[PDB]
Amino acid sequence: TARKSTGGKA
C-alpha cells in the first residue's frame, strides 16, 4: 500500500 516515503529501495 502506498505511503509517504523518504526515498527509494534496492
Add this chain to the structure above:
Amino acid sequence: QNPNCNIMIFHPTKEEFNDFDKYIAYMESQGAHRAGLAKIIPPKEWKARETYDNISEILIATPLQQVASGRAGVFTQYHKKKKAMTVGEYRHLANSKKYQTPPHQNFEDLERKYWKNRIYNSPIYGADISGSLFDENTKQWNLGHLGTIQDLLEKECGVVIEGVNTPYLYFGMWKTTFAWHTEDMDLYSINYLHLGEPKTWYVVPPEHGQRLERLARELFPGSSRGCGAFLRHKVALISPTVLKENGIPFNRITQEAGEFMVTFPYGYHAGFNHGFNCAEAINFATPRWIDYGKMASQCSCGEARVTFSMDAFVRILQPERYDLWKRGQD
C-alpha cells in the same frame, strides 16, 4: 510582497497560535509562500510535550541505510533496510565513532564536509515511522490534529495515507538526508524538531521549480526513461554549489530543536541532519493548495504511488468551478 523570495521567520504570540489555518493564511499574506519554505518559532511558553524522558524504548522497526553514489555535489541515494533497534540503541549508534558528527569549526565547515564526504559511512535514518510525540493536551500546532481542509480526504473519501494525513517520526543522525522533492500532490508539509541536533534545509522558490526539474534531467542520465516525474522518486542529491553554478535560485536555513518549518505547495526542498535528533512531520492543505493539487505531476512508473482524486476538494471548496473542472477532466 517578499519579492526576493527570502525564507521568512515568524514569531506568533500565544493568541496567534490558536488557529493554525488562520496563521498560515497570515504568513502567506506577508509573502512567505514565495520562498517555498518558512520557519515558525513557537511562543516562549508553548511546549509540544512535557518530557522526552521515556522515548528510548520506542522500537524503530525498519531503520534505513542511506547509500549515496556520485561525486562533485551530484549523487543518487538508495535505501537498504537494517535490523530493528530501539531509539536508545539508535542514539548510541548515532554517537559512535563511525557515525558521530565530525569535528568542525562552524556551519559552513560542517556543510562543506556533508557535501564532500557524502559517499562515506552511509548513515542510518530512522525515517517514516507512523506516530507522534505531541502530548494529547497540546491543542496548538499539534501535528496530529491541525484541522486543515486536508481532513476531507479521510472524512469524505475514507482515504488514509500514512505520513500524508497521519504523522511521521524521523530519528536522525549526522549525514542522514532528504533528497530534492515537493510533497505528494504538491501538498504543504510541516516539520517540528522535537529534540537533538539541527536539521538544515535547502529550498528553491516555487516560481523556479521547473528550472530544478530541468537541471535534474541534465544531471541524471536516463532520469526520464519511463517516467515524467523523476524527482518524485526522491533519489536525487544536488549540492548548493551545483545549484549556484547552474543559476538555480535557492535559499538555505537551519532548523533548531523546538522550531517548525513549513514547506509550501511546489516548493522543492532537500537537506540533512547534523547529528542525533527527532523530528515529526505531516502534510496539510489549504484552499490555495487546491489548484496546485489539480496541476501536480504524477509518477507513471510505480516508484512513487501516493495519489488521490481532487474531486471532493473541488466539489466542496470550489463549488462555482466544479462543473468547469469536471469538463476539463473529460
